[PDB]
Amino acid sequence: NNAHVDNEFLILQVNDAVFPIGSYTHSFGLETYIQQKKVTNKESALEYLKANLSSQFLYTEMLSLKLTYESALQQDLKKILGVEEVIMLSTSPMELRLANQKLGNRFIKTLQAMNELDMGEFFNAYAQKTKDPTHATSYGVFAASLGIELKKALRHYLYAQTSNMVINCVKSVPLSQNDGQKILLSLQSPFNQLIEKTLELDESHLCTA
Amino acid sequence: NNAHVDNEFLILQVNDAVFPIGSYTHSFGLETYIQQKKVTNKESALEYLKANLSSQFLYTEMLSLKLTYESALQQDLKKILGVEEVIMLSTSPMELRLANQKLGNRFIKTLQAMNELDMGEFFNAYAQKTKDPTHATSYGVFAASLGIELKKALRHYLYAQTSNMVINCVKSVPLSQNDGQKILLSLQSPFNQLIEKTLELDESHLCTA
């Protein structure tokens, strides 16, 4: 059914800022750091981003993507829903939880609206049953369902999220556009460290940051 | 010098809509098609996009990217400048030519502002000598200079440009966001056809559409 679908383009399409699912929620956490004088320049923005990437973003978002990808390969819907339950029961404040659930639901619905894309029965079942989807967990199931390699799936998702984080810093601090690009370049080695760490973690580390 | 640079992330970074070089110029050509009732819905937008992609966008933009990539591998700056000369002497109207030159200059300058990225001597020389850079021609030299595979370089550039074309249609016609995503999905096979055709063409085809 997916002979006309090229995963090499589809992975760009679903990570594009124009993929119509709403804004990522990283700006929620950043808002306090600017008002309270912590993030003021390129250097302190870089510090904040490295710290964020290696804490909650790693132990919740990135890890959850890996876990639901791996569980989807095993057709273990119970484990996927279990992961989503842990995340929901750990996320504060409620406004952020609701924003995250909205984003996950919109990701699933936007895929389903593309009627000429067959997500397969396991994804169909996941979409029918999910109560607390997130962008990362639904994306993990999506990537596994289409046979997209895990490391690649992680790279594209990580870059897209981080581009959003950096542009939030550029607009909110504010910084020059050139400082934004220097930050993104500086984060490439951290990105590789983060992906390698993600592959070492498991359910026992979920939401532990 | 580039041990800390990962081309797999850099190619996403330079094709991101936030890469600070200004807007792509595809909307210039589209403006007439909407006012004059040609592009009115998803189907006619798809028709217009396929036609555009396989005409001037192929025989000027995509081909020029391939030509300057290949010439950069040969360290043939004369041929690169020759390609840019042909394009400049073929582009109408003057407002679009100036917009294209501005975009090419900004692409080069934005790369050069990232002081921790070494583009290499050949790129340095190209940047010193170029008179009529374009985004596609400068990107070709950039990709070859960093050892990014041609097909990959073409895929990321083609997707980014087409995402811009489709969102212009979504906003200007206007269309629903879902129709935009259906169009992008429908263009994946055309994309592969376009890349394969680009690899068959040479200087004798440049600007012939």
Curated annotation (Swiss-Prot), chains A, B:
The keyword RNA-binding does not apply. Keywords: Chaperone, Cytoplasm, Nickel insertion, Virulence. One of its GO terms (cellular component) is cytoplasm. It is found in: Cytoplasm. Disruption phenotype: Cells do not express urease. GO terms for biological process: metabolic process. One of its GO terms (molecular function) is nickel cation binding. Required for maturation of urease via the functional incorporation of the urease nickel metallocenter. Belongs to the UreF family. UreH, UreF and UreG form a complex that acts as a GTP-hydrolysis-dependent molecular chaperone, activating the urease apoprotein by helping to assemble the nickel containing metallocenter of UreC. The UreE protein probably delivers the nickel. This is Urease accessory protein UreF. It comes from Helicobacter pylori (strain ATCC 700392 / 26695). The gene is ureF. The chain holds residues 25 to 233 of 254 of the full protein.
